[PDB]
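Protein: Ubiquitin-conjugating enzyme E2 G1
Species: Homo sapiens
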Amino acid sequence: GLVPRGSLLLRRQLAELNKNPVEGFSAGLIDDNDLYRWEVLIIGPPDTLYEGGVFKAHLTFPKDYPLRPPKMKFITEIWHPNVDKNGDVCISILHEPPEERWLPIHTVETIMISVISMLADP
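Structure follows.
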């Protein structure tokens, strides 16, 4: 058994998230065997286009995380300028070159903060 290096980081994040649940989203593994493939459930914010909505996105971490950012893709249909027709999310926190670029220090919380903000202002 060879453990991917970022496993400890990802496990800590998952646990930190589970012990500090947040309003408006839940994050977990699609498959407990696999720390690199997450799903995030996101509640559409009040007084927006998305109010009443609930959305599933996949957050997929590269095997060399945290040096490279995860990729995010909405699975539930959604309309947003930063979300392409495949569902892929185009957001600067997830672009390689503080929250306007990927830095190895960004956590899932940092990413979701940015995603929630972009929905609260389409």
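Remarks: The beta strands are 25-29, 37-43, 54-60, 71-74.
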